[PDB]
Ligand binder design. Structure first.
Ligand SMILES: NC(=O)c1ccc(C(=O)O)cc1
Length: 338
């Protein structure tokens, strides 16, 4: 009942913000630009500093014309409407949002420890306790999101940032969607796609639990389970129903992963009658105190090394490009609700 009442309140609070979203809560000239932290085909993330408060933020800047051309309109509206409505310890917080003639802006908390991916690749692989600490945070986060009828759809090591306490913050809601039944869009990253996405089926929240299986495997092995040189080869391995486990994996880990990496979505852990509890009660998680993780009372496996809230040393170097704002409004109609 404690969990039921927690999730009921969580849904109430989400729905109030979902139905009446915040809009236009800052503007670009309130910020100084510091450094580009990441870049893609239609957007970038920039470390910025608020000129009045001195606080640092990660500002995601999306070019409206490129969002339209790459068919990401609905996805970008999803991302902002969801982010302004959610609240969970392991989700990066949206602090402000706004738009101008050229761009959409989501001003997020800055997480200076960098991507889990960087740390994983530095050290090679995580021990099972270390992987389990991060995995438990994802389990709770998906329990939260799924209870709100949200599917995340972009789990991968690059999207898990490590905070100043060594805990995970999930970023990038670009593929997240409120889905009460099924959905159909081809999205994600190849190594993490569930078979039913590859096969163009109407799919549901079970794809997130598949992706958790991939993530746990990659954390504990150092490489993902369906690895191959080209996407088509990855996809063939994903749909095959076969996975090879390193001998160093524990039997408990292998058993959990066989149940998460279950090709038949109707037999996949997280999607059975007991829902998330088949995962939370699995022997691989027997040492996990779920409440203590939620309350951030567990000592983390490591604290990232950084000098302060403005340190960018855990992120990498990109060409610094202009944030140009056209004299004419672009795509105003498409982004009216942002
Ligand atoms: N909230 C952040 O600190 C944050 C940092 C980097 C990125 C990226 O490179 O996409 C995203 C978010």
């Amino acid at each position: 009942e404690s969990v039921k009442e927690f999730l009921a309140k969580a849904k109430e609070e989400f729905l109030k913000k979902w139905e009446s979203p915040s809009q236009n809560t800052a503007q670009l000239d309130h910020f100084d630009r510091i450094k580009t932290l990441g870049t893609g085909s239609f957007g970038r993330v920039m470390l910025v500093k608020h000129k009045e408060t001195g606080n640092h933020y990660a500002m995601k800047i999306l070019d409206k014309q490129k969002v339209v051309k790459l068919k990401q309109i609905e996805h970008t509206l999803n991302e902002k409407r969801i982010l302004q409505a959610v609240n969970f310890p392991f989700l990066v917080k949206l602090e402000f949002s706004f738009k101008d003639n050229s761009n959409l802006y989501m001003v997020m908390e800055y997480v200076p420890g960098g991507e889990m991916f960087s740390h994983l690749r530095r050290i090679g692989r995580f021990s099972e306790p270390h992987a389990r600490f991060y995995a438990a945070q994802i389990v709770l986060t998906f329990e939260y999101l799924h209870s709100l009828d949200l599917i995340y759809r972009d789990l991968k090591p690059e999207n898990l940032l490590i905070d100043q306490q060594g805990y995970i913050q999930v970023t990038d809601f670009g593929f997240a969607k409120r889905v009460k039944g099924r959905t159909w869009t081809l999205c994600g990253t190849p190594e993490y796609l569930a078979p039913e996405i590859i096969l163009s089926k109407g799919y549901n929240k079970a794809v997130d639990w598949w992706a958790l299986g991939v993530l746990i495997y990659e954390m504990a092995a150092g490489y993902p389970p369906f690895f191959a040189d080209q996407p088509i080869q990855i996809y063939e391995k994903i749909v095959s129903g076969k996975v090879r486990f390193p001998s160093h994996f524990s039997s408990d880990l292998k058993d959990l992963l066989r149940n998460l990496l279950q090709v038949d979505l109707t037999k996949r852990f997280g999607n059975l009658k007991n829902g998330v509890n088949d995962i939370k009660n699995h022997k691989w998680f027997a040492t996990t105190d779920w409440i203590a993780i939620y309350q951030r009372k567990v000592e983390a496996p490591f604290i990232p090394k950084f000098k302060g809230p403005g340190d960018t040393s855990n992120f990498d170097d990109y060409e610094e490009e202009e944030i140009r704002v056209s004299i004419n409004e672009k795509c105003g109609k498409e982004f009216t609700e942002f």
